[PDB]
Amino acid sequence: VKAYMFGIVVQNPDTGQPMGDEFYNHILERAVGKAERALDISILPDTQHE
């Protein structure tokens, strides 16, 4: 994600503190779910009991 934003950095203006990868991973986990519903698909490997 940072590579796609090369030359751009996000910082809290009241600090010299950027955001951690925890937020990015949280976004990515929700993001992959979003594509997981845009298509009626399960993407990550998982066992199923149907």
Partner: protein
């Protein structure tokens, strides 16, 4: 050969200045945005040369 003569020249010299007075000496700003804390910075002076 030029023992008793008047010599005249045209010449190029490098430019030089000295400071006679300082005009609009100090200008200031409390820069705080996107900083850990407030900071003081000196903005450009103007010089009369």
């Amino acid at each position: 050969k030029y023992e008793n003569h008047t010599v005249t020249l045209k010449i190029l010299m490098t430019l030089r200045y000295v400071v006679s007075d300082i005009l609009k000496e100090s200008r200031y700003q409390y820069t705080k945005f996107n900083q850990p804390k407030s900071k003081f910075e000196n903005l450009p002076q103007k010089l009369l040369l």
